[PDB]
Amino acid sequence: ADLFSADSAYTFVQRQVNFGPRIPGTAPHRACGDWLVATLRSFGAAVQEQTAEIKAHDGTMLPMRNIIASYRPEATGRMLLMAHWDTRPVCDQDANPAMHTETFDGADDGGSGVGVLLEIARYLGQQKDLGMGIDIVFFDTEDYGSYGDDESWCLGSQYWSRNPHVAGYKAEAGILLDMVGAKGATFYWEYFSKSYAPGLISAVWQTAAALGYGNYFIQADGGALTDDHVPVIKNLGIPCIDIINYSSKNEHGFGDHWHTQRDNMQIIDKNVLDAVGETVIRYLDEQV
Ligand SMILES: [Mg+2]
Ligand SMILES: [Zn+2]
């Protein structure tokens, strides 16, 4: 019995990629967001969209579109799962400087976390009685920033955590998935995750260990990464962790495909998606 379908998650990554790059303000972004909403609703979630016009670092006005999907919306004890769904507009880390003005698929950076969570949604919609409320949030406009400028990233999570869909929203725990699909990925303890949610990072990494995934979930320090979980911690006080492919042994910390033309379907590994999905589902089931 396989609780998390790696084949299905892989297909959700490919679906997103086949729309074209999900660049804020563009037609593939609108079409893919439409499909993400319809698909979450077909898996039994109550889905609402949170929209706003946000100013990006270069002055572009972006039509931000956060996607919020809920199971058992009346329950007071809730678990929060997160991923960003936009694609950075340019592969400005490509090894070929001529590519820094071009677009790329965002298969891992964007596709992988959404794909894993769509498959978890499919699983949740089949349960006959959830033991807690569950929210799945896909943040927009995470990846439109500038490297010297931390506030220029994670615009959708900053907006949502300051203006959530219920007043004073609380979840007991929050898990962010970012770049969880590439062959050879290494999930170390991200610093802010460990500093603010030691119990959660311990429970998740220990669950992965018990499932046989200690070759992916490494019990050692990783990077201090500003990501969508940090605004949630700071503004909502929810202990959140980030599961993210990162190692200080990597040239750019992130995997070698990050913000290059090689972040495309050929670097995606079903076994990495499975390790992450099976760990998350097991942890969720053991909370109830
Ligand atoms: Mg599986
Ligand atoms: Zn990125």
CB 191 within 8 A of CB 223: yes
User: CA of 284: how far to CAs of 16, 81, 131, 154, in Å?
Assistant: 25, 10, 9, 25
For the beta sheet containing 78-84, the strands, ordered from the edge strand earlier in sequence to the opposite edge, are 46-55, 61-71, 133-139, 78-84, 173-178, 240-244
To the question of whether residue 263 is assigned a binding role by annotation, the answer is no
Grouping H, G, I as helix, E, B as strand and the rest as coil, residue 224 is coil
Q: How far is the CA of 74 from the centre of ligand 2 (A)?
A: 34
DSSP H helices in 55-101: none
Please state the domain extents for the chain.
Answer: 1-288
DSSP secondary structure, 102-113, as one string: S----IIIIIIH
To the question of whether residue 227 is assigned a binding role by annotation, the answer is no
What Rg value do the Cα atoms of the chain yield, rounded?
A: 17
d(CA 156, CA 161): 9
Q: Which two tokens stand for residue 6?
A: 């790696």
Closest CA to 138 of 153, 157, 155, 119: 157
Buried b (16+ CB within 10 A) or exposed e, 42-59: ebebebeebebebebeee
Residues with CB under 5 A from ligand 2 (ion): 88, 109, 143
HSE value, Cβ hemisphere, 13 Å, CA-based, for 85: 31
To the question of whether residue 217 is assigned a binding role by annotation, the answer is no
Q: How far is the CA of 154 from the centre of ligand 2 (A)?
A: 10
DSSP H helices in the chain: 6-19, 27-42, 113-125, 155-162, 191-196, 198-211, 229-236, 270-287
Q: Quick one: resolution in A?
A: 2.0
To the question of whether residue 149 is assigned a binding role by annotation, the answer is no
CB 253 within 8 A of CB 223: yes
Q: How far is the CA of 270 from the centre of ligand 1 (A)?
A: 9
Strand partners, 82: 137, 176
d(CA 288, CA 212): 22
To the question of whether residue 100 is assigned a binding role by annotation, the answer is no
As a residue count, the chain comes to 288
Q: How far is the CA of 262 from the centre of ligand 2 (A)?
A: 13
**Determination technique used:** X-ray
